[PDB]
Design a binder for this molecule. Structure first.
Ligand SMILES: *[C@@H]1O[C@H](CO)[C@@H](O[C@@H]2O[C@H](CO)[C@@H](O[C@@H]3O[C@H](CO)[C@@H](O[C@@H]4O[C@H](CO)[C@@H](O)[C@H](O)[C@H]4NC(C)=O)[C@H](O)[C@H]3NC(C)=O)[C@H](O)[C@H]2NC(C)=O)[C@H](O)[C@H]1NC(C)=O
Ligand SMILES: *[C@@H]1O[C@H](CO)[C@@H](O[C@@H]2O[C@H](CO)[C@@H](O[C@@H]3O[C@H](CO)[C@@H](O)[C@H](O)[C@H]3NC(C)=O)[C@H](O)[C@H]2NC(C)=O)[C@H](O)[C@H]1NC(C)=O
Ligand SMILES: *[C@@H]1O[C@H](CO)[C@@H](O[C@@H]2O[C@H](CO)[C@@H](O)[C@H](O)[C@H]2NC(C)=O)[C@H](O)[C@H]1NC(C)=O
Ligand SMILES: *[C@@H]1O[C@H](CO)[C@@H](O[C@@H]2O[C@H](CO)[C@@H](O)[C@H](O)[C@H]2NC(C)=O)[C@H](O)[C@H]1NC(C)=O
Ligand SMILES: *[C@@H]1O[C@H](CO)[C@@H](O[C@@H]2O[C@H](CO)[C@@H](O)[C@H](O)[C@H]2NC(C)=O)[C@H](O)[C@H]1NC(C)=O
Ligand SMILES: *[C@@H]1O[C@H](CO)[C@@H](O)[C@H](O)[C@H]1NC(C)=O
Ligand SMILES: *[C@@H]1O[C@H](CO)[C@@H](O)[C@H](O)[C@H]1NC(C)=O
Ligand SMILES: [Ca+2]
Length: 948
């Protein structure tokens, strides 16, 4: 084993012979003086974080207020038209004309629409009438459905008025209590259609206030057999009617009441918690003696906890039994004498047991009685309890008409991620006579207007900030309304297995890495406050392989009208941005001909960012086509165009002149320098200018510079960044593309720091080997690694065939101890929006744990002894200053015949975190401040068994 001083000298030579090449084959020191000698050709401007947030928060308020005015119009013109409707039972002499959504009949005429293709939506729509969706088990032609199709025809005239005033209006829909949903504009419906508007999350949230459901399941002996699998399915179907604002728990009594799961109290009933209850309900067995007194005592005790987070709203009990002879009148007189807890009773299966006491508990307590005799009756009977819960909401009157916004979910008619406004509609016939109170206590339906997340993303411009800056907004629950890591895919709740329905509720702390400062920041944003905090955090690179530390400034404000909170994460070196000032048609032309595809040979393979430069230029994935279309839009139509942006194109053109000069003045004076397979440059404007045109095929990065992993990684650091390649033919060319060596530029115009562009090279493995050698031995192995534990080159020429691979996957013993000496920290996290191949017992969503490694401290030299067991291995790790590389010198693996289990830095399918302990200390949240129950004027005489 050599000495440290000569290795330090051996390290010192791959620090001045490697940085200088990257400093001279890329022109990093030359681009900054290019930006400096045309300083007047642009101007730096403030990027005020406080100002930008409120301006963007004031625009989101107006967009959400545009659609609130559309909801009140549609609810005020649905109460009026319904009252004037005359209930008529003969539909043959007077047919109903409407368009059925799911179609290619006396008593009702059908329309054939024109279905012109239109933007915004991703389908064919007709702006002349509203389409109607009727569930497949709901018969059109009935006296109930047909009567609903007349008074819901004046809605079409209000649908078009709303669209005409606001051309950007998305789906407007009326979900009727009958079952049919009438939506505008008309568009044909998307195997077996199981859609029902009365089960949708936006319908349920407006049909009643949040609840405190507690399900009681009879698991005694008499329910064994078919009536048990009907109970198990029924409970699994009412859990689907609970949102994140409701609280639920499932219990069971078989002469001794117990819980079915690991909860023991009411839980938040989100996606993860409901999966536990569904899995626990499927595992119950029927055996024992029925005892209603012990079961109901347990239920009333669990609804009287008040130690944990709850809804402080509708307290209801569902009893899933078959029949019996016990009334349990002693329990009901002991726990709810004031009848502040509703009891809904269900009779499941075909049997000959007494249903007398079951219907009595539903009439004394202010509930309802339902019967489920087969599988087909499960769906309807498990969603009708919202008609009883809406009785106090109707009697409130105009105080209950508040617009509510649901969580982010996927539209049934495929449109991406949307949120929906909501406003209930009341039955007010005979209101001017003041004596109906018969069916007027129920709602007619729920209004609905959809707002896509793309509309909100347009109110928060991003290209003015750095690639590391972004906006995000959260619910009063922690769920992000908009976030860069929120993807249009459902979240996973475990490992998939084989033998639009759920909202995309991703918490703020699960979107990015979790700190302790970012928990109090989240709590201060759910509380509707406004502040600012600058701190050092750990940010994860675009590719989940690295972790970087930097400075960030979280500036947040509350949105006035709604209950959201918008925040802007503006890092340092981004508080000021470059605004392109240029007023000329010939000097801007000199910039324009640079991007000409036919000129590429002397300018390099030039790319372009598919941004929205103009509302007439259509973006495309093929950047060759987009550059072709872009370059026939600047010349054919003058830059003084009132049609589209001014800064976006003036910056791209200004970028071209600054970028192309480096190609012509420095990158063209030399063509072959040692080994450099590519000479690239990426800038905020949106252009990349890889100089060898042939090498442009190796470039497999996003044309949009704001989503390039190496750009963001090299932005935070003050030193060079080596991007490790991939492995297992993920990309084309291991030694045929090179090794990226990024380096960001820094300028000072008026004592102000700016980082407009990044430069670098793509040094080759072959040439780098020769300088490293001064070899394929069997005694020692010398290998360099980057910040993240990836291999870039070795000595045995057997590891070099696996470049760009985790060191732990090829040498586990050294990697694991290398963490133990505290040079490679790691932070693990869960990716809820991920897909993985199914297991066994068609890719499905799942949770995969991700690991990323980074430097612990600023120590430069490392040395120690590896004791693998009856062995003594020694090493000398040294860090390459001014880069992110580390050099280690260790003996060969063959010296010690030890082989521990391999370490993997990759996403691994998992199920954590465990929700059993996540409910003991749940995250902070704020529930709605409105609660509608216990109205004295309620009827209470409408059970399901008081009549029959
Ligand atoms: C909003 O509320 C209003 C009232 O608050 C409601 O209008 C009422 O609609 C019902 C129909 O559902 C009318 O009932 C009339 O009287 C009886 C009661 O159903 C019907 O006679 C038979 O009833 C049986 C039910 O036991 C039924 O199966 C049968 O089909 C009926 N017909 C027969 C046997 O021929 C009448 O047919 C029915 N209609 C008449 C007399 O025209 C109430 O009279 C209506 N009340 C008022 C004040 O107009 C309205 O439906 C609610 N809105 C919605 C969307 O439901
Ligand atoms: C559900 O039931 C009927 C199905 O169309 C509709 O009732 C008919 O609507 C017609 C269209 O307005 C009426 O014709 C005109 O009605 C207006 C209003 O009174 C007047 O201009 C004339 O009466 C008539 N115009 C003529 C004859 O040139 C029918 O009179 C009317 N019939 C009945 C029996 O009501 C309902 O409107 C429909 N519901 C909704 C909400 O549209
Ligand atoms: C949300 O509303 C509050 C108050 O309703 C706004 O607070 C204002 O803050 C400015 C800052 O100096 C004050 O000058 C105003 O007087 C405040 N308003 C009132 C009514 O006192 C807050 O700005 C609003 N949010 C946004 C994003 O505009
Ligand atoms: C929490 O729940 C418990 C029981 O459900 C409530 O009762 C208390 O239980 C603790 C521990 O057994 C003791 O303090 C007393 O035996 C009970 N009474 C009081 C007044 O503490 C308890 O009140 C609930 N709340 C809190 C804050 O503990
Ligand atoms: C990310 O990794 C860091 C470093 O490995 C970890 O934070 C350290 O946690 C230990 C354990 O309490 C503390 O003693 C150190 O002081 C922490 N380092 C700091 C605060 O710099 C942790 O695994 C992750 N840090 C997070 C999530 O903030
Ligand atoms: C919708 O909101 C935007 C943003 O404020 C603006 O065009 C206007 O306020 C609304 N449009 C209307 C009312 O047509
Ligand atoms: C890819 O699969 C595994 C993943 O590490 C690797 O060991 C194997 O050699 C690779 N196979 C091919 C054909 O590239
Ligand atoms: Ca029994």
């Amino acid at each position: 084993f050599p000495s440290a001083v000569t290795i330090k000298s051996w390290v010192d030579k791959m620090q001045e012979d490697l940085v200088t090449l990257a400093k001279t084959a890329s022109g990093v020191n030359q681009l900054v003086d290019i930006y400096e000698k045309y300083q007047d050709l642009y101007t730096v401007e403030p990027n005020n974080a406080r100002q930008l947030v409120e301006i963007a928060a004031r625009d989101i308020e107006k967009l959400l207020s545009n659609r609130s005015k559309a909801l009140v119009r549609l609810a005020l013109e649905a109460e009026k038209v319904q009252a004037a409707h005359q209930w008529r039972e003969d539909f043959a002499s007077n047919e109903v004309v409407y368009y059925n959504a799911k179609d290619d009949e006396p008593g009702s005429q059908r329309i054939k629409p024109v279905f012109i293709e239109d933007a915004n939506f991703g389908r064919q729509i007709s702006y002349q009438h509203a389409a109607v969706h009727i569930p497949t088990d709901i018969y059109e032609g009935s006296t109930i459905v047909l009567n609903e199709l007349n008074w819901t025809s004046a809605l079409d005239e209000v649908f078009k008025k709303n669209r005409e005033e606001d051309p950007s209006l998305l789906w407007q829909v009326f979900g009727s209590a009958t079952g049919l949903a009438r939506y505008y504009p008309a568009s044909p419906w998307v195997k077996i259609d199981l859609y029902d508007v009365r089960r949708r999350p936006w319908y349920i949230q407006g049909a009643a206030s949040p609840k405190d459901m507690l399900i009681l399941v009879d698991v005694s002996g008499s329910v064994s057999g078919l009536t048990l699998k009907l109970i198990r399915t029924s409970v699994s179907e009412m859990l689907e009617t609970l949102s994140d604002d409701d609280f639920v728990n499932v219990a069971s009594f078989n002469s001794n009441a117990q819980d079915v799961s690991c909860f023991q109290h009411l839980v938040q009933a989100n996606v993860r918690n409901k999966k536990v209850l569904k899995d626990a309900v499927n595992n119950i067995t029927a055996k024992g003696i029925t005892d209603y007194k012990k079961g109901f005592s347990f239920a009333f005790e669990q609804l009287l906890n008040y130690n944990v987070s709850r809804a402080n709203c509708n307290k209801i009990i569902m009893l899933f039994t078959d029949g019996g002879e016990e009334r349990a009148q002693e329990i009901f007189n002991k726990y709810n004498k004031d009848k502040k807890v509703r009891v809904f009773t269900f009779s499941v299966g075909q049997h000959n047991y007494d249903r007398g006491p079951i219907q009595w508990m539903a009439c004394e307590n202010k509930g309802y009685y339902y019967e489920i005799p087969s599988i087909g009756a499960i769906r309807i009977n498990t969603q009708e309890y919202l008609d009883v819960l809406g009785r106090p909401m109707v009697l409130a009157g105009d105080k209950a008409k508040q617009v509510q916004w649901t969580n982010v979910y996927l539209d049934a008619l495929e449109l991406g991620l949307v949120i929906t406004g909501t406003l209930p509609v009341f039955n007010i016939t005979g209101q001017f006579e003041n004596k109906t109170n018969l069916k007027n206590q129920l709602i007619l339906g729920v209004m609905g207007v959809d707002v896509s997340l793309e509309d909100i993303k347009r109110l928060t411009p991003r290209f003015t900030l750095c690639p590391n800056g972004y906006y995000f907004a959260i619910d009063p629950n922690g769920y992000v309304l908009l976030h860069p890591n929120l993807q249009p895919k459902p979240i996973g709740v475990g490992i998939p297995t084989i033998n639009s329905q759920e909202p995309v509720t991703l918490d703020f702390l699960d979107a990015e890495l979790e700190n302790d400062i970012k928990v109090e920041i989240r709590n201060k944003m759910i509380d509707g406050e406004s502040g600012e905090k600058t701190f050092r955090t750990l940010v994860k690179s675009q590719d989940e392989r690295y972790i970087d530390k930097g400075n960030r400034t979280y500036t947040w404000t509350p949105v006035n009208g709604t209950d959201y909170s918008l925040a802007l994460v503006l890092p340092t070196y981004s508080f000021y941005y470059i605004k392109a000032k240029l007023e000329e048609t010939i000097t801007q032309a000199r910039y324009s001909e640079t991007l000409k595809p036919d000129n590429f040979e002397e300018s390099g393979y030039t790319f372009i960012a598919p941004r929205d430069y103009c509302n007439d230029l259509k973006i495309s994935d093929n950047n060759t086509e987009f550059l072709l279309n872009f370059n026939e839009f600047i010349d054919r139509k003058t830059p003084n165009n009132p049609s589209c942006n001014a800064d976006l194109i003036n910056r791209v053109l200004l970028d071209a002149g600054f970028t192309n000069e480096l190609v012509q003045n420095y990158w063209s004076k030399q063509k072959n320098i040692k080994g450099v397979k590519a000479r690239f440059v990426v800038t905020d404007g949106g252009i990349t200018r890889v100089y060898p045109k042939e090498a442009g095929e190796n470039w497999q990065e996003n044309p949009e510079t704001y989503e390039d992993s190496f750009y963001k990684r090299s932005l935070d650091n003050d030193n060079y960044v080596f991007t490790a390649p991939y492995f297992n033919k993920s990309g084309p060319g291991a030694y045929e593309s090179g090794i990226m060596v990024s380096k960001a530029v820094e300028i000072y115009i008026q004592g102000k720091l700016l980082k407009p562009a990044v430069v670098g090279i793509k040094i080759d493995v072959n040439s780098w080997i020769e300088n490293f050698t001064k070899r394929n031995s069997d005694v020692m192995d010398c290998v360099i690694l980057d910040d993240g534990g990836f291999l870039l080159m070795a000595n045995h020429d057997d590891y070099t065939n696996q470049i760009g691979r985790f060191f732990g996957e090829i040498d586990p013993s050294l990697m694991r101890h290398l963490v133990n000496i505290s040079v490679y920290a790691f932070n693990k996290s869960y990716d809820y929006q991920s897909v993985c191949e199914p297991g066994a017992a068609s890719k499905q969503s799942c949770i995969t744990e991700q690991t990323q490694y980074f430097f612990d401290n600023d120590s430069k030299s490392f040395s120690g002894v590896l004791d693998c067991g009856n062995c003594s291995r020694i090493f000398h790790g040294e860090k390459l200053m001014n880069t992110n590389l580390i050099f280690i010198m260790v003996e060969s693996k063959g010296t010690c015949p030890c082989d521990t289990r391999l370490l993997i830095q990759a996403e691994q399918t998992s199920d954590g975190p465990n929700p059993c302990d996540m409910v003991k200390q749940p995250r902070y949240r704020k529930g709605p401040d409105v609660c509608f129950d216990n109205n004295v004027l309620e009827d209470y005489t409408d059970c399901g068994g008081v009549s029959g």
